Structure formats: structure tokens, C-alpha cells
Amino acid sequence: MDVFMKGLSKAKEGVVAAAEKTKQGVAEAAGKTKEGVLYVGSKTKEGVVHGVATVAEKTKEQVTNVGGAVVTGVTAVAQKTVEGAGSIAAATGFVKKDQL
Amino acid sequence: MDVFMKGLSKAKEGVVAAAEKTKQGVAEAAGKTKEGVLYVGSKTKEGVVHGVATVAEKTKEQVTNVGGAVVTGVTAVAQKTVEGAGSIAAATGFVKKDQL
Amino acid sequence: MDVFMKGLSKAKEGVVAAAEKTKQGVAEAAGKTKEGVLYVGSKTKEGVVHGVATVAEKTKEQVTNVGGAVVTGVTAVAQKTVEGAGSIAAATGFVKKDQL
Amino acid sequence: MDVFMKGLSKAKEGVVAAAEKTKQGVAEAAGKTKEGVLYVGSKTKEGVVHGVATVAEKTKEQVTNVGGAVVTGVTAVAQKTVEGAGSIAAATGFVKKDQL
Amino acid sequence: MDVFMKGLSKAKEGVVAAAEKTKQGVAEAAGKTKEGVLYVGSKTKEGVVHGVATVAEKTKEQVTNVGGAVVTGVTAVAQKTVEGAGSIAAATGFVKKDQL
Amino acid sequence: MDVFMKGLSKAKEGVVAAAEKTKQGVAEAAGKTKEGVLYVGSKTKEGVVHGVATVAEKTKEQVTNVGGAVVTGVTAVAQKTVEGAGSIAAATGFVKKDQL
Amino acid sequence: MDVFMKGLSKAKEGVVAAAEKTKQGVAEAAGKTKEGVLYVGSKTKEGVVHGVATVAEKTKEQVTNVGGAVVTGVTAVAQKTVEGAGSIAAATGFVKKDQL
Amino acid sequence: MDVFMKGLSKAKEGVVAAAEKTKQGVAEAAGKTKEGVLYVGSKTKEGVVHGVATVAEKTKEQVTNVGGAVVTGVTAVAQKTVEGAGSIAAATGFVKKDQL
Amino acid sequence: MDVFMKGLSKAKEGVVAAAEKTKQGVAEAAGKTKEGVLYVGSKTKEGVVHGVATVAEKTKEQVTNVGGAVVTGVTAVAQKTVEGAGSIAAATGFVKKDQL
Amino acid sequence: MDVFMKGLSKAKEGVVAAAEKTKQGVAEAAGKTKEGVLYVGSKTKEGVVHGVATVAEKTKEQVTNVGGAVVTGVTAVAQKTVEGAGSIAAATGFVKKDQL
């Protein structure tokens, strides 16, 4: 009656160049919980910006965004309110309760 | 009566260039819970922006967004409210309760 | 009476160039729950923007979006409200309760 | 009386270039639940935008969207309200309850 | 009395270029449930936009959308309300309850 | 036997505002001769030009003449040739040859 | 037998404002001769030009003449040629040859 | 037998403001001769030019003449040639040859 | 047998403001001769130029003439040639040859 | 048998402000001769230039002439040639040859 987990990675020849959250041999038992959360952001992998030119002769405004991944003008609100009673929130990887 | 999990990755020759959340041999038992959450964002993989030009002679406004993945002008609200009673929210990978 | 899971990945020659959430040999038992959630975003994979030009002589406004995947002007609201009673929400990968 | 799952991937020569949620040998037992959710977004895979030109001599407005997949001007609301009683919502991958 | 599932993928020579939700050898037992949900979005695979030009001499308005897949001006509302009693909603991959 | 000429001008109150070749009391005995002559010209007396506006957006030519008296594009030739013999041309005011 | 000429001008109150070749009491005996002559010119008396505006956006040519009396583009030739013999040209005011 | 000429000008109150070749009491005996002559010119008397504005955005040429009397682009030739014989040209004011 | 000429000018109150070649009591006996002559010029009397503005953004040429009397671009030639024989040209004011 | 000429000018109150070649009581006997002559010039009397402004942003040429009387770009030639024989040219004021 015993938990057993392991992860092997025998790499003869391998490459991980520009990656994110890779798993190349793992034994995971994660459990996660997110109540009021908020992600805002832009990500680029192997991007190229190769020549940009902006001019402005006689103007009152000029805005510009050019990069390989842009995010502008957001108004986010992510909340969770509890004014009553009882807000259990459980999250587990696994449960092993076995008799004999 | 025993849990057994494992993950192998024998790589003779492999490549993971520009990826996200890859799994190349895993044994996962995840459980997740999200109550009030919010994602806003733009992602680019192997993008190329190769020559941009904007001008403005006599204008009151000029806005511009050019990158390989753009997101603009959002107004997001993601909430969860509980003013009554009882909001159980359970999430598990697996459950092993077996007698003998 | 024992759970057994595993994942193999013997790669002689393989490539994963610009991908997202790939699985190349896994044994998964996930369980997930999303109550009030919201996704807004644009994604590009192997995109090319190869020459853009905008001008403006005498104008009061000019807006422009050119990238390979654009998203503009959204007004999203995703909520869940409970003012009564009882909002169980359960999600599991599997359940093994067998006697003998 | 034992659950058994596994996933093999012997790759002699393979390619996954620009993909999303691929499975190349898996044993999955997922269960998912979504109460009030909302997706808004545009996705491009192997797109090319190869020469764009916009001008404006004397105008009060000019808007433009050119990328390979555009989404504009949405007003989404996705909700679930419970003011009465009883909103069970269960979702499982499988259930094994067998006696002997 | 034992569940047995597996997935093989022996690839001598294969290609998956621009795909979405492919399965090349799997053993799945999914179960899913969606109560109030909403999808809005445009997707492009191997698209080409090869030369666009718009002008405007003296106008009060001009809007334009050109990309390979466009979606504009939607007003979506997808909800589920329960003010009475009893809203069971169950979804399973399979069920194995056999005696002996 | 005597020539007698004179000119009086008793001006109590008079005005000559914008005139040309006026005679207000004279005794003239002119004689004139014009062989090859040429007059080209425009004359204005008490003229008013009170607001002129010309524009040109995109043209190859635009000519304009607005004043109170215009003359344009003439090709004049006024000559007198004598290759023979005898071209007397006499002009006198008067002749007084009287005997007694 | 005597020539007698005179010119009086008794001015109590008079005005000559903008004039040309006026005679206000004279005794003239002129004689004139013009063989090959040429006049080109514009004259203005009491003229007013009260507001002129010309613009040119994108043109190859634009010519303009606005004044109260204009003359443009003439090609004048006024000549007299004598290759034969005899070109007397006499002009006198008067002649007084009287015997007694 | 005697020539007698004179000119009086008794001015109690007079004005000559902007004039040309005026005679206010004279006794003239002129004689003139013009063989090959040429006049080109513009004259203004009591002229007003009260506000002129010219602009040019993007042009290859723009010419302009605005004054109260303009003259442009003439090509004048006024000549007299004598290759034969005899070109008498006499001009006198008067002649008094009277015997007794 | 005697020539007699004179000129009086008794000015009680007079004004000569902006004039040219005025005669206010004279006794003239002029004689003039002009063979090859040429006048080119512009004259102004009591002129006003009260506000001029010229601009030029991006042009290859711009010429302008604004004054109250302008003259531009002339090509004048006034000549007299004599290759034969005999070109008498006499001009006298008067002649008094009377016997007794 | 005697020439007699004189000129009076009794000025009680007079003014000569801005004039040219005025004669206010004279007795003249002029004689003049002009063979090859040339006048080029501009004259102003009581002129006012009251505010001039010229600008130039990005131009290859800009010429301008504003004064109250302008003359530009002339090409004058005034000549007299004699290659034959005999070019008498006489001009006298008067001649008095009377016997007795």
C-alpha cells in the first residue's frame, strides 16, 4: 500500500530553444485553486521586427504600437465576494483512502 | 493496493523550438478550480514584421497597431457573488476508495 | 486493486516547432471546474506581415489594425451569482470505489 | 479489479508544425464543467499578409482591419443565476463501482 | 474485472502542419458539461491576403474589414436561470457497475 | 495778315478726377503722321476688384486673369514696306499762302 | 504780318486729381511724325484690388494675373522698310507763306 | 513781322495731385520725330492693393502677378531699315516765310 | 522783326503733389529727334500695398510679383539701320525766315 | 531784331512736394537728339508698403518682388548702325534768319 512515482529523462541529443512550461519526463500530482485572479500580458517567441519608421508633420496626436505582440487599453476587474455563508473550494491531485 | 505512475522520455534526437505547455511523456493527476478569473493577452510564435511606415500631415488623431497579434479596447468583468448559502466547488484528479 | 498509469515517448527523430498544448504520450486523469471565467485574446503561429503603409493628409480621425490576428472593441461580462441556496459543482477525472 | 491506462509514442520521423491540442498517443479520463464562461478571440496559423496601403485625404473618420482573422465590435454577456434552490452539476470521466 | 485502455502511435513518416484537435491514436473516456457558455471568434489556417488598398477623399465615415475570416457587430447573450428547484445535469464517459 | 490764336481757362470751381487727353480751352494747330505703328494695352479708370479666390487640387494647368481690363495672347505685326519709288506722306495743321 | 499765340489759365478753384495729357488753356502748334513705333502697356487710374487668394494643392502649373488692368503674351513687330527710293514724310503744324 | 507767344497762370486756389503731362497755360511750338522707337510699361495712379494671399502645397510651378497694372511676356521688335536711297523725315511746329 | 516769348506764374495758393512733366505757365519752342530708342519701366503715384502673404510647402518653383505696377519678362529690340544712302531727319520748333 | 525771353515766378504760397521735371514759369528753347539710347527703371512717388511676409518650408526655388513698382527680367538692345553714307540728324529749338 505505497505511492510510487518517478520521472526519467535520458537525453542522447535534444534541444529546448525558446519554450515555456515543458515537461520531458515527470510524475506530477498537482492541485491548484484560484479564486480571484487576473492575467494581462503579451508574450513573443522568436520574433523579428525589422524596420519601422513613423513621422508627424503637424498633428495634435499620434499613437503607435508595433511590436510582435501588443496589448493596449484594457480595464479588467476580476473579483469574488462572499457576504452570505459557506464557500468551500477544495482541489486535490488524488486521494487514496482504501481499507483492508 | 498501490498507486503507481511514471513518465519516460528517451530522446535520441528531438527538438522543441517555440512551444507552450508540451508534454513528452508524463503521468499527470491534476485537479483545478477557477471561480472568478480573467485572461487577456496576445501571443506570437515565429512572427515577422518586415517594414512599416506611417505618416501624418495635418490631422487631429491617428492611432495604429501593427504587430503580429494585437488586442485593443476591451472592458472585461468576470465575477462570482454568493449572498445566499452553500457554494461547494470540488475538483479532483481521481479518487480510489475501495474496500476488501 | 491498484491504479497504474504511465507515459512513454521514444523519439528517434521528431520536431515540435510552433505548437500549443501538445501531448506526445501521456496518461492523464484531469478534472477541472470553471464558474465565472473569461478569455479574450488573439494568437498567431508562423505569421508574416510584409509591408504596410498608411498616410493621412487632413483628417479628424484614422484608426487602423493590421496584424495577423486582431481583436478590438469588446465589452464582455461573464458572471455567476447565487443568492438562493445550494450550488454544488463537482468534477473528477475518475472514481474507483469497488468492494470485494 | 484494477484500472490500467497508458500512452505510447514511438516516433521514427514525425513533425508537428503549427498545431493546437494534438494528442499522439494518450489515455485520457477527463471531466470538465463550465457554468458561466465566455471565449472571444481570433487565431491564425500559417497566415501571410503581403502588402497593405491605406490613404485618407480629407475625411472625418476611417477605420480599417486587415489581418488574416479579425473580430470587432462584440457585446457579449454569458451568465448563470440561481435564486431558487438546487443546482447540482456533476461531470466525471468514468465511474467503476462493481461488487463481487 | 479491469478497465484497460491504451494508445499507440508508431510514426515512420508523418506531418501535421496546421491543425486543431487532432488525435492520432488515443483511448479517450471524456465527459463534459456546459451550462451557460459562449464562443465568438474567427479562425484561419493557411490564409493569404496579398494586396489591399483603400482611399477616402471627403467622407463622413468609412469602415472596412478584409482579413481571411472576419466577424463584426454581434450581440450575444447565453444564459441559464434556475429559480425553481432541481437542475441535475450529469455527463459521464462510461459506467461499469457489474456484479458477480 | 497775321495768325492769332489763344486759349483761356477761367475756373471758378472745377474738377478733373481721372481723365486722359482733356482740353479745357485751347487753340491747337496739330499735324501728325504715323507710318508703321502699333498700340497694345489695357486701361482702367475708377475700377474696383473686390474679392477673388482660385484653388487647384490636382491639375496639369490653370491660367487666370481677373483685373478690370485684360488683354492676352496677341500676335501683332504692323509694317510698311517701300521697294519701289515715291512715298510722300505730308500732314499739316493748316496752310496760309495768300497774296495781295 | 505776325504770328500771335497765348494761353491763359485763371484758376479760382480747380482740381486735377489723376489725369494724363490735360490742357487747361493752351495755344499749340505741334507737328509729329512716327515711322516705326510700338506701344505696349497697361494703365490704371483710381483702381482698387481688395482681396485675392489663390491656392494650389498638387498641380503641374498655375498662372494668374489679377490687377486692375493686365496685358500678357503679346508678340508685336512694327517696322518700315525702304529698299527702293524716295520716302518723304513731312508733318507741320501750320505754314504761313503769304506775299504782299 | 514778329513772333509773339506767352503763357499765363494766375492760380488763386488749385491742385494737381497725381497727374502726367499737364499744361495749365502754355504757348507751345513743338516738333517731334520718332523713327524706330518702343515703349513698354505699366502706370498706376491712386491705386490700392489691400490684401493678397497665395499658397502652394505640392506643385511644380506657380506664377502670379497681382499689382494694379501688370504687363508680362512681351516680345517686341520695332525697327526701320533703309537700304535704298532717300529717307527724308521732317517735322516742324510752324513755318513763317512771308515776303513784303 | 523780333521773337518774343515769356512765361508767368503768379501763385496765390497752389499745390503740385505727385506729378510728372507739369507746366504751369511756359513758352516753349522745343524740337526733338529719336532714331533708335527704347523705354521700359513701371511708374506708381500714390500707391498703397497693404498686406501680402505667400507660403510654399513643398514646391519646385514659385514666382510672384505684387507691387502696384509690375513689368516682367520682356525681350525688346528697337533699331534703325542705314546701309544705303541718305537718312536726313530734321525736327525744329519753328522757323522764321521772312524778307522785307 | 532781337530775341527776348524771360521767366517770372512770384510765389505767395506754393508747394511742390514729390515731383519731377516741373516748370513754374520758364522760357525754354531746347533742342535734343538721341540716336541709340535706352531707359530701364522704376519710379515711385508717395508709396507705402505696409506689411509683407513670405515663408518657405521645403522648396527648390522661391523668388519674390513686392515693392510699389517692380521691373524684372528684361533683355533690351537699342542700336543704330550706319554702314552706308549720310546720316544727318539735326534738331533745333528755333531759327531766326530774316533779312531787311
Contact at 8 Å (CB) between B31 and C93? yes
Mark yes or no for CB contact D1/B98 under 8 Å.
yes
Question: Which of H6, H16, H42 shows the shortest C-beta gap to I16?
Answer: H16
Contact at 8 Å (CB) between F83 and G83? yes
Coil/strand/helix, residue A43: strand
Residue F50's identity, in one-letter code, is: H
Residue J82 grid coordinates: 550706319
* Cα gap D27→C23, rounded to integer Å: 11
Provide the 10 A C-beta neighbour count for residue J8: 14
Annotated binding site of J for Cu cation: 2, 50
Which residues in chain F are closer than 8 Å to G55, comparing Cβ atoms? 54-56
* Cα gap A6→G48, rounded to integer Å: 103
E75 exposed, middle or buried (CB, 10 Å; 0-12, 13-18, 19+)? exposed
Which residues are registered as beta bridge partners of F74?
Answer: G74
The DSSP bridge pattern shows strands D48-49 and E48-49 to be parallel
Provide the 10 A C-beta neighbour count for residue A53: 9
Distances (CA, A) of I69 to B38, B98, J70: 77, 115, 7
Mark yes or no for CB contact F24/G19 under 8 Å.
no
- Resolution of this model in Å is 3.2
Contact at 8 Å (CB) between D42 and D68? no
Q: Spell out a b/e string for D87-99, using b for 16 or more CB atoms within 10 Å of the CB, else e.
A: bebbbbbbbbebe
F vs H, Cβ pairs < 8 A, gives 17
Distances (CA, A) of G15 to B71, F20, H15, I46: 83, 14, 5, 16
* Cα gap H25→G10, rounded to integer Å: 9
Cell 493628409 belongs to: C57
CATH number of domain containing A54: 1.10.287.700
Residue I64's identity, in one-letter code, is: T
Please give the DSSP secondary-structure letter assigned to residue J65.
B
Contact at 8 Å (CB) between H72 and G69? no
Q: How far is A93 from chain B (nearest CA, A)?
A: 5
* Cα gap B99→C98, rounded to integer Å: 7
Q: What is the domain extent for residue C8?
A: 1-100
Residue H35's identity, in one-letter code, is: E
* Cα gap H64→I65, rounded to integer Å: 6
Edge-to-edge, what's the strand order for the sheet holding B4-7? A4-7, B4-7, C4-7, D4-7, E4-7
* Cα gap C87→B89, rounded to integer Å: 8
CB contact H92 to F (< 8 Å) = no
Cell 522520455 belongs to: B9
* Cα gap H80→I75, rounded to integer Å: 18
* Cα gap C67→C65, rounded to integer Å: 6
Would the annotation count B70 as a binding residue?
Answer: no
Q: How far is C50 from chain D (nearest CA, A)?
A: 5
* Cα gap H87→H80, rounded to integer Å: 10
Task: Please tell me which chains touch I, using 3 or more CB pairs under 8 Å as the contact test.
Answer: G, H, J
Task: Please tell me which chains touch J, using 3 or more CB pairs under 8 Å as the contact test.
Answer: H, I
Which residues in chain J are closer than 8 Å to I33, comparing Cβ atoms? 32-34, 89-91
Question: Structurally, how many domains does chain E consist of?
Answer: 1
End-to-end CA separation in angstroms for chain E: 10
Cell 510564435 belongs to: B45
Mark yes or no for CB contact C47/B38 under 8 Å.
no
Question: Which of H24, H67, H95 shows the shortest C-beta gap to I24?
Answer: H24
Residue G27's identity, in one-letter code, is: A
* Cα gap E36→D35, rounded to integer Å: 5
Helix spans in B3-99 (H)? none
In chain I, where do the E strands start and end? 4-7, 10-11, 14-16, 26-28, 31-36, 39-40, 43-45, 48-49, 52-54, 70-82, 89-96
Q: How far is D90 from chain E (nearest CA, A)?
A: 5
Angle at B36 between CA B30 and CA B42, to 5 degrees: 80
A28 CB-near residues (< 8 Å, 6+ apart)? A93, B26, B27, B28, B29, B30
I9 CB-near residues (< 8 Å, 6+ apart)? H9, H11, I24, I25, J8, J9, J10, J11, J24, J25
What DSSP string runs through F42-89?
Answer: -EEES-EE--EEE--SS-S----B-SSSEEEEE--EEEEEE-SB---E
A vs B, Cβ pairs < 8 A, gives 377
Q: Spell out a b/e string for G67-97, using b for 16 or more CB atoms within 10 Å of the CB, else e.
A: bbbbbbbbebbbbbbbebbbbebbbbbbbbe
Residue I63 grid coordinates: 514666382
Distances (CA, A) of E88 to B95, C60, E91, J62: 22, 56, 10, 86
Residue of I nearest to J63 (CA): I63
Cell 521645403 belongs to: J58
Q: Spell out a b/e string for J38-76, using b for 16 or more CB atoms within 10 Å of the CB, else e.
A: bebebbbbbbebeeeeeebeebeebebbbbbbbbbebeb
Dmax (CA) for chain C in angstroms is 85
* Cα gap J68→E56, rounded to integer Å: 45
Contact at 8 Å (CB) between D34 and D79? no
Residue of C nearest to B78 (CA): C78
End-to-end CA separation in angstroms for chain I: 10
Contact at 8 Å (CB) between J67 and J44? yes
Nearest one of G78, H65, J82 to I76, comparing CA atoms: G78
F8 exposed, middle or buried (CB, 10 Å; 0-12, 13-18, 19+)? middle
Which residues are registered as beta bridge partners of A79?
Answer: B79
Nearest one of B18, D44, D6 to E8, comparing CA atoms: D6
Please give the DSSP secondary-structure letter assigned to residue B23.
B
Cell 469574488 belongs to: A80
J100 exposed, middle or buried (CB, 10 Å; 0-12, 13-18, 19+)? exposed
Residue E77 grid coordinates: 447573450
H89 CB-near residues (< 8 Å, 6+ apart)? G33, G35, G87, G88, G89, G90, H33, H35, I88, I89, I90
Nearest one of D47, F32, F68, H92 to G48, comparing CA atoms: F68
- Technique behind this structure? cryo-EM
Mark yes or no for CB contact F36/G40 under 8 Å.
no
Contact at 8 Å (CB) between C68 and B67? no
Please give the DSSP secondary-structure letter assigned to residue I23.
B
* Cα gap H66→J52, rounded to integer Å: 14
* Cα gap I73→I80, rounded to integer Å: 23
What DSSP string runs through H14-64?
Answer: EEEEE-SS-BSSEEE--EEEEEE--EE--EEES-EE--EEE--SS-S----
Q: What are phi and psi of F21, to 5 degrees?
A: 60, 55
* Cα gap D28→A5, rounded to integer Å: 18
Mark yes or no for CB contact J94/H9 under 8 Å.
no
Q: How far is G55 from chain F (nearest CA, A)?
A: 5
A9 exposed, middle or buried (CB, 10 Å; 0-12, 13-18, 19+)? middle
Mutate to test the interface with D, among C46, C83, C97, C100 (most CBs of D within 10 A): C46
Task: Please tell me which chains touch G, using 3 or more CB pairs under 8 Å as the contact test.
Answer: F, H, I
Which residues in chain B are closer than 8 Å to D16, comparing Cβ atoms? none
Residue F29's identity, in one-letter code, is: A
The DSSP bridge pattern shows strands E31-36 and D31-36 to be parallel
In E23-89, where do the E strands start and end? 26-28, 31-36, 39-40, 43-45, 48-49, 52-54, 70-74, 77-82
Residue H15 grid coordinates: 491742385
Residue E31's identity, in one-letter code, is: G
* Cα gap J73→J78, rounded to integer Å: 16
Cell 512572427 belongs to: B47
End-to-end CA separation in angstroms for chain B: 10
Cell 505640392 belongs to: H58
Angle at J87 between CA J83 and CA J91, to 5 degrees: 155
Number of H helices, E strands in chain J: 0, 12
